């Protein structure tokens, strides 16, 4: 039997530096985790020990920290090249800076193949990008070869900025003929590496005949066999075994997100490329693993430009940006309006003739707004100022919520009003009126929402059975601040852009801001 060790990362999301346990900024270095310097140490150790190793990334290195803001993917090519990745699949966030922001910095500078079998280009773009990503690559591993076939979420146009000259095909439709072709070329060991989420990964394992292993991402899925090593709660065993339509057992793996874990799967293959066994577990990259000194020194050199950028003017405000708790936990506050307006702007994506934009609505818990910004520094706003407002290292995500669920969220917003608690909601594209003389659970007396399926945006009453797209913090999508109804009833969730970055981009675009309090939230 021929044994392969697959090492894999996914959804690293710009966590170049080691992090806290929750993947936010490292404070107590002695307890920090992840980062590329520590990953280097562990990969190097494994490569000393195991003869046949592939290091794979299932996408979404782009977007998540000031590294991406400043270096725009150059840091991804540089540090993935230093780690000697063998292959990477395109994730949705690889399109955040458009096709141009993918071709240049990443496709042209990577020393490993970048893969996606279900993305096609037309017009002059097709000639410009031809060969810079591939449907698959056949890699030599010891005296054998292994085919790696990529895929990317069909939903990328709604979750990033790929433009109108790329088409994202159904994954299984695109993958099958490529896997069929590799069989005709005497490639009998095939890994599907891609970025569509755990549910689609299981469908690929089931339906794409000849796939031996699926290495996925996008959904930040943590899988584990045994007692888990940290705070993440497993969604299933590692690997997750799918029974394929051809009767084979097909392992499916993912490794959470944020570079906290290194996925590690050992596969035994017979002479015909059938999987005989698979076993492993992600490895928690905790402080017991030293940061590689050479990688750490290069990280510290690259950090200088981040420190310099952090104090640069992004734009100006001519108004006080009231992020005080005394405002934002009690009533509409202009910082809340700014952040929600930035959230909606960030989610302007290419539209049908069927909608002006696919999403129009935003909620933001006031407890998530952690500082005001004074306008009397010549109006200057810096990244450092925004990091004081939004210090948690979160994202502004896209969810689908029934109106009934959103009504329950607005009732929860004021269930115990008057205590300065964090659940009070700031809004965009929503007008709410409360009557606090009513019983908890029955205080929302008006709730109107901005249309999407309309050529002129206007407000309509919220409908209980209609499903609305809403931009909101990951903290709330995960049921933080008591919003259990959001976690338990949402129909879709996709992780979005870094919270600070969303607001910084909006302020940079606007140049001079003057958000008002305007009656999005009223009391009767």
Which stretches of the chain bind ligand U, using CB under 6 A? 365, 367-368, 392, 394, 422, 475, 480-481
Q: Is the peptide bond before 239 cis (omega within 30 degrees of 0)?
A: yes
373 DSSP 8-state letter: B
272/278 Cα distance (integer angstroms):
16
Beta carbons of 273 and 188 less than 8 angstroms apart = yes
Q: Where are the beta strands (DSSP E) in 77-134?
A: 87-89, 114-115, 119-121
Q: Is 218 known as a binding-site position?
A: yes
Q: 473 - beta bridge partners? A: 396
Q: 270 - beta bridge partners? A: none
> What x/- string results for residues 163 through 202 when contact with Zn ion is judged by CB under 5 A?
----------------------------------------
**Partner in contact with 481, chosen from Zn ion, Ca ion, ligand U, none, beta carbon below 5 to 8 Å by kind:** ligand U
Work out the angle at residue 75's Cα, subtended by the Cα atoms of residues 163 and 393, and round it to the nearest 5 degrees. 80
212 binds Ca ion (CB under 5 A): yes
Beta carbons of 381 and 10 less than 8 angstroms apart = no
Q: Which of 194, 259, 273, 323 binds Ca ion (CB under 5 A)?
A: 273
Q: Is 431 known as a binding-site position?
A: no
Compare residues 263 and 428 and give the one whose CB is closer to a copy of itself. 428
Compare residues 192 and 275 and give the one whose CB is closer to Zn ion. 192
Compare residues 248 and 415 and give the one whose CB is closer to Ca ion. 248
308: closest CA among 481, 84, 69? 69
Stretches 118-126, 146-154, 211-219, 418-426: which one binds Ca ion (CB under 5 A)?
211-219
497 binds Zn ion (CB under 5 A): no
Q: 316 - beta bridge partners? A: 380, 512
Q: Is 11 known as a binding-site position?
A: yes
Q: Which of 431, 467, 479, 523 binds a copy of itself (CB under 8 A)?
A: 431
Q: Is 481 known as a binding-site position?
A: yes
Q: Is 520 known as a binding-site position?
A: no
CA distances in angstroms from 184 to 188, 245, 248, 263, 397, listed in the order given: 9, 20, 20, 30, 42
Q: Residues 6 or more apart from 322 whose CB is under 8 A from it?
A: 328, 333, 334, 335, 372
432/448 Cα distance (integer angstroms):
7
> What x/- string results for residues 346 through 365 when contact with a copy of itself is judged by CB under 8 A?
--x--x-x--xx--------
- Nearest distance from residue 507's CB to a copy of itself, in Å? 14
319 binds a copy of itself (CB under 8 A): yes
338/328 Cα distance (integer angstroms):
12
Q: Is 92 known as a binding-site position?
A: yes
Known binding residues for AMP are 329, 365, 370, 392, 475, 481
Residue list, annotated binding site for IMP:
329, 365, 370, 392, 475, 481
Residues that bind a copy of itself (CB under 8 A): 318-320, 322, 334, 348, 351, 353, 356-357, 375-376, 431, 450, 455-459, 509, 511-512, 514-519
Q: What are the residues binding Ca ion (CB under 5 A)?
A: 188, 212, 273
């Amino acid at each position: 039997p021929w044994e392969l060790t697959i090492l894999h990362t996914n959804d690293v999301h710009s966590r170049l530096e080691q992090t806290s346990e929750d993947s936010s900024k490292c404070v107590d270095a002695s307890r920090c985790m992840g980062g590329v310097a520590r990953l280097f140490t562990k990969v190097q150790q494994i490569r000393r020990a195991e003869p046949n190793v592939l290091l794979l990334d299932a996408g979404d290195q782009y977007q998540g920290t000031i590294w991406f803001t400043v270096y725009k993917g150059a840091e991804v090519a540089h540090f993935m090249n230093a780690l000697r990745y063998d292959a990477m699949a395109l994730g949705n966030h690889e399109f955040d800076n458009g096709v141009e922001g993918l071709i240049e910095p990443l496709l042209k500078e990577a020393k490993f193949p970048i893969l996606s079998a279900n993305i096609s280009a037309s017009g002059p773009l097709a000639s410009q990008i031809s060969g810079l990503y591939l449907p698959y690559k056949v890699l030599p591993v010891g005296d054998e070869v292994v085919g790696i076939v990529g895929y990317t979420s069909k939903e990328t146009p709604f979750l990033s900025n790929p433009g109108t000259n790329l088409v994202f095909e159904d994954e299984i439709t695109a993958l099958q003929p490529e896997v069929d072709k590799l069989k005709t070329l005497n490639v009998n060991k095939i890994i599907a590496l891609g970025h569509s989420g755990f549910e689609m990964d299981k469908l690929i394992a089931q339906k794409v005949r000849g796939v031996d292993v699926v290495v996925g991402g996008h959904s930040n899925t943590f899988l584990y066999t045994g007692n888990p090593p940290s705070k993440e709660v497993p969604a299933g065993k590692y690997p997750f075994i799918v029974t394929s339509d051809d009767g084979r057992k097909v392992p499916v793996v993912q490794a959470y997100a944020f570079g906290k874990y290194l996925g590690y799967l050992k596969i035994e293959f017979d002479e015909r490329g059938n999987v005989i066994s698979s076993h492993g577990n992600p490895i928690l990259l905790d402080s017991s693993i030293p940061e590689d000194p050479s990688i750490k020194a290069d990280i510290n050199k690259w950090r200088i430009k981040l420190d310099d950028y952090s104090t640069q003017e992004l734009g100006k405000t001519i108004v006080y940006l009231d992020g005080s708790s005394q405002s934002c936990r009690f009533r509409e506050c202009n910082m809340g309006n700014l952040i929600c307006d930035a959230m909606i702007n960030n989610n302007l994506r290419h539209a049908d003739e069927m909608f002006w934009n696919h999403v129009s609505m935003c909620i933001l818990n006031g407890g998530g707004i952690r500082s005001p910004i004074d306008e009397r520094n010549d109006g200057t706003i810096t990244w450092e100022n925004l990091a004081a407002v939004l210090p948690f290292g979160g994202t502004f995500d896209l969810v689908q919520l029934k109106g009934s669920t959103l009504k329950k969220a607005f009732e929860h917003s004021v269930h115990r009003y008057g205590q300065s608690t964090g659940e009070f909601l700031q809004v965009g594209g929503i007008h709410v009126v409360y009557d606090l003389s009513r019983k908890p659970g029955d205080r929302v007396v008006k709730l109107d929402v901005l249309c999407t399926s309309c050529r002129v945006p206007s407000y309509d009453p919220l409908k209980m059975d209609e499903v609305y797209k809403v931009i909101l913090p990951n903290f709330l999508a995960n049921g933080g601040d008591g919003f259990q109804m959001i976690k338990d009833e949402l129909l879709r969730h996709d992780s979005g852009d870094q919270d600070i970055n969303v607001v910084s981009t909006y302020i940079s675009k606007m140049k001079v801001i003057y958000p008002a309090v305007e009656g999005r939230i009223k009391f009767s």
